[PDB]
Amino acid sequence: YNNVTLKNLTAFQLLSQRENICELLNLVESTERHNSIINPERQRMSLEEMKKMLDALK
């Protein structure tokens, strides 16, 4: 799995290409790949950490 092949590159391009046309008709959820990457509690924890760094550097 360290290297890529012709079939691997073609299958990678095909899996990256089908999921774009799959979202226009909206027949897939694609919410677990959304919320686990956004993570709004992690975002507000990030804002609290930047505010804590402001309070520590002032």
Partner: protein
């Protein structure tokens, strides 16, 4: 140390940003032009399916049988170079 794993995490997050940027750019170009990108999809995905369906007649139990050579004139990949490989001595 922790610097190598930290740079690994920053590089992985930059690759996630590159994925999000390319997925934004594809829908942005599809919003700019709707015509010549769907025919582009119907061409390129069909060619990618033809490439991924180009290695199916060379399996273990598929080559030991006789449903490759016999009566498969619609395949056109093999059984046409036997007049060329015999003239070169490859047998």
């Amino acid at each position: 140390a922790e610097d190598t794993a930290k740079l690994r995490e920053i590089t992985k997050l930059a690759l996630q940003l590159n994925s999000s940027a390319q997925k934004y750019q594809f829908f942005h170009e599809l919003s700019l032009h709707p015509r010549e990108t769907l025919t582009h999809y119907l061409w390129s995905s069909k060619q990618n399916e033809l490439v991924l369906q180009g290695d199916q007649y060379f399996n273990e139990d598929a080559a030991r049988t006789s449903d490759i050579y016999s009566n498969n004139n619609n395949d056109r990949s093999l059984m046409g170079n036997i007049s060329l490989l015999y003239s070169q001595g490859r047998l």
